[PDB]
């Protein structure tokens, strides 16, 4: 019956994108209630991006030096201000297509959908993970700053990401929706380091369960092993250690399939020490870590949706 | 700046899904104007699916034996009828969220987005290819029949697929929107054959161009070769032959990157005869054929969207 990397429907979010402009720079903004969210470097030129003094740069604009635009319609300004690395504009219309929504600060290894936008218009949507080094491997061209990430919650859009930076190494960086960067980075054109990205072990395991459920099941073997024994090897291959909170949330798949977490680890242990590069699981010739246990459970069951 | 498998925004389509029911069976339907589209086997039980006489089964229902439902709201019936393997219900409301749209019959190797739905509600969206054997490798659980595929066109939704069948081999089958199956299949629970799925050669090539543009560029080499020379090998590895229409549409990428189609073929020729299984391109440890040349051109350029 199959297993696809899929994203959440993006309807609820498309009606919230707008374009923000501040005499020259245009990027994307998130229009909820009577408030537009957007990255604060929209008040910078390209020169200014070497070292922005955001204090001094913002103190010069004003509630008209900012060009918000939702559909036909310009909107009008009423209040501006900076919440960490986001600006929060005030404007003269509560947004009717505003949905039930939260903001939250997700953690490394959780997944979400990105709605890539250009000049306030949607381009596409894809499902990505937040790397353990708090970057994402996204797909963004210039102008896409302000595109948002959203996981879901359940009928209630949980905004988790705003895109700000492409690093000079190729990877992508951004904030949560009240402006707090994920990871060390700053909004400043500099060669800054992420360093070591690890493979998300709990996600690889959930994906192995998804494989068994469909029946790419060749990779299994009856070795057993301990946490301790498995976590030793995982550190050799830069896989995240797997603690007891991970074993627990895999329990549901443990039960539906008949396979203890620690037995699945053993077959993965061995996929790692060799890489039986004969074959394929769910097609992929590499081990997948962008599905969480919750994702597999939805793509299997809990989403024959209402 | 990166390269993701991404789907089109699904906003325009979500507002067109409804649930169709005919005393028991519920599947998904496409509600445009004052017409609902849905698979015709919604008038079958599970027993009946062995050998349905659609003639005789339809002649028994009627414009009330059918339970359409869009949001709150039931709708009312007015006319029913069967267009090949789809039913086209009449009902008492033109659908306001109906968008500009066409139907067309796409060809093997073209790509589109699927909006997987359950009981008329959206579950997710993903970007898949139509295999040369006119199947798709989708992700569908029971109830998802009537989920639609749509490529786009340009601001105008082009509906290209309706899901009908999971084959007893795992792959998926369906029709265009005026009811014509893609491939040989019939809407009838039987062990029926697709046979040989080939790799879509023009798509692999466009993906190799996408790789160079980002700069996973190791796989290139200065062998040259002829069409003839390349197509000989491709048939050894069940890759589709590549004719002159394919060389042409690759021309745009040929130009932006500095690499003739036939030179790129040569590096692929050799990826094929060995599989330099050392490495990775765009991450993938296998050759990708679910991006078309148009997709790469959009994911690179023509979609800094308006």
Swiss-Prot record, chains A, B:
Activity regulation: Inhibited by pyridone-containing alpha-ketoamides compounds 13a and 13b. In turn, alpha-ketoamide 13b (tert-butyl (1-((S)-1-(((S)-4-(benzylamino)-3,4-dioxo-1-((S)-2-oxopyrrolidin-3-yl)butan-2-yl)amino)-3-cyclopropyl-1-oxopropan-2-yl)-2-oxo-1,2-dihydropyridin-3-yl)carbamate) inhibits SARS-CoV-2 replication in human lung cells. Inhibited ex vivo by michael acceptor inhibitor N3. Inhibited ex vivo by compound 11a and 11b.
Domain (Peptidase C30) ranges: 1-306
Cytoplasmic side: 1-306
Catalytic activity, as annotated: TSAVLQ-|-SGFRK-NH2 and SGVTFQ-|-GKFKK the two peptides corresponding to the two self-cleavage sites of the SARS 3C-like proteinase are the two most reactive peptide substrates. The enzyme exhibits a strong preference for substrates containing Gln at P1 position and Leu at P2 position
Chain positions of cross-link Glycyl lysine isopeptide (Lys-Gly) (interchain with G-Cter in ubiquitin): 5, 90
Record note on what altering residue 142 to A does: Does not affect ability to cleave and inactivate human TRMT1
Compartment list: Host cytoplasm; Host Golgi apparatus; Host nucleus
Residues at the catalytic site: 41, 145
Domain of life: Viruses
Oligomer status and interactors: 3CL-PRO exists as monomer and homodimer. Only the homodimer shows catalytic activity. Interacts with host FBXO22; this interaction promotes the proteasomal degradation of nsp5.
Purpose of the protein: Cleaves the C-terminus of replicase polyprotein at 11 sites. Recognizes substrates containing the core sequence [ILMVF]-Q-|-[SGACN]. Cleaves and inactivates human TRMT1, preventing tRNA guanine(26)-dimethylation of tRNAs. May cleave human NLRP1 in lung epithelial cells, thereby activating the NLRP1 inflammasome pathway. May cleave human GSDMD, triggering alternative GSDME-mediated epithelial cell death upon activation of the NLRP1 inflammasome, which may enhance the release interleukins 1B, 6, 16 and 18. Also able to bind an ADP-ribose-1''-phosphate (ADRP).
Protein name (record): 3C-like proteinase nsp5
Species, as recorded: Severe acute respiratory syndrome coronavirus 2 (2019-nCoV)
Organism classification: Viruses, Riboviria, Orthornavirae, Pisuviricota, Pisoniviricetes
Shown part of the complete sequence: 3264 to 3569 of 7096
């Amino acid at each position: 019956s199959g297993f696809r990397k899929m994203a959440f429907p993006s309807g609820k979010v498309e009606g919230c994108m707008v374009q923000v402009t501040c005499g020259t720079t245009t990027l994307n903004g998130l229009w909820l209630d009577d408030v537009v969210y957007c990255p604060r470097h929209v008040i910078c030129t390209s020169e200014d991006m070497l070292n922005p003094n955001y204090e001094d740069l913002l103190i010069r604009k004003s509630n008209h030096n900012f060009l918000v635009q939702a559909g036909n319609v310009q909107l009008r300004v009423i209040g501006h201000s900076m919440q960490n690395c986001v600006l929060k504009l005030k404007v003269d219309t509560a947004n009717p297509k505003t949905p039930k929504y939260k903001f939250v600060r997700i953690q490394p290894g959780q997944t979400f959908s990105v709605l890539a936008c250009y000049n306030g218009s949607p381009s596409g949507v894809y499902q990505c993970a937040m790397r353990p080094n708090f970057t994402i491997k996204g797909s963004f061209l210039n102008g896409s700053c302000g595109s948002v990430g959203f996981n879901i919650d359940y009928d209630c859009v949980s905004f988790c990401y705003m895109h700000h930076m492409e690093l000079p190494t190729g990877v992508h960086a951004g904030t949560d929706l009240e402006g707090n960067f994920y990871g060390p980075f700053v909004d400043r054109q500099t060669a800054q380091a992420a360093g070591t990205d690890t493979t998300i072990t709990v996600n690889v395991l959930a994906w192995l369960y998804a494989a068994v459920i469909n029946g790419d099941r060749w990779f299994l073997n009856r070795f057993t092993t301990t946490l301790n024994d498995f976590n030793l090897v995982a550190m050799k291959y830069n896989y995240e250690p797997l603690t007891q909170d991970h074993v627990d949330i895999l329990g549901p798949l443990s039960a539906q399939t008949g396979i203890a977490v620690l037995d699945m680890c053993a077959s993965l242990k061995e996929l790692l020490q060799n890489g039986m590069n004969g074959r394929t699981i769910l097609g992929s010739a590499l081990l997948e870590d962008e599905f969480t246990p919750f994702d597999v459970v939805r793509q299997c069951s809990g989403v024959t949706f209402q």
